[model samples]
Target: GTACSCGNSKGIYWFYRPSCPTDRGYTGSCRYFLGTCCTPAD
Candidate 1:
């Protein structure tokens, strides 16, 4: 699984979860955010 930084000056958000598999009706592969203060990617 890969974790990406996405947010703004308000705060930073990060997440971790299982990666998606091919054609399996598994929407659980999506990332979930843990709110915190930091500098995220642009």
Candidate 2:
């Protein structure tokens, strides 16, 4: 999987699915960093 530097305080980040869904009810499959998952700000 490709890695990304989101310029956030957490450091490097990436998408859980390589490509995340834009709709709702799709929690835990958005973004990830340091083995933790979270929703994208967008």
Candidate 3:
């Protein structure tokens, strides 16, 4: 998959799951936040 935007930003998924919540998608790992998820500007 691709970066699902900031807020929708996803990171190292949980061993139990493979993506973020329904409200957001997975983006491998955001560029900032120590490669963690983030918030959307929109």
Candidate 4:
């Protein structure tokens, strides 16, 4: 799920979900994620 960061930045967000197997429709792979801060409105 996407988590929004609260700050002076503009809509900075991040998310990460584990990958599932073919039975679950993910081909049995793991998943990772990262995100950076956004520019805030002046």
Q: Which candidate gets the maximum TM-score versus the true structure?
A: 2
41, model 4: CA deviation in Å?
Answer: 5.0
RMSD of each: 10.7, 8.2, 8.7, 11.8
Question: Cα miss at 3, model 1 (Å)?
Answer: 23
Candidate 4 per-residue lDDT, tens place, 1-42, comes to 333333422332323333222333221222234543222211
Q: What clash pairs does model 2 have?
A: none
Distance (Å) between predicted and true CA of 8, model 3? 18
Query: Candidate 1 at 31: error in angstroms?
Result: 9.4
Better of 1 and 4 by lDDT: 1
Provide the TM-score for each candidate, comma-separated.
0.19, 0.23, 0.19, 0.19
Which ten residues in a row are the worst by lDDT in model 4?
21-30
lDDT by candidate, in order shown? 0.31, 0.39, 0.38, 0.30
Error of 1 at 29 (Å): 4.1
| Cα shift from native, residue 27, model 2 (Å) | 16
Instruction: Give the Å shift of residue 41 in candidate 1.
Output: 33
**Model 4, 13: alpha-carbon shift in Å?**
2.6
Off by over 4 Å in 1: 1-17, 29-42
**Model 2 weakest 10-residue run by lDDT:** 4-13
Distance (Å) between predicted and true CA of 39, model 1?
30
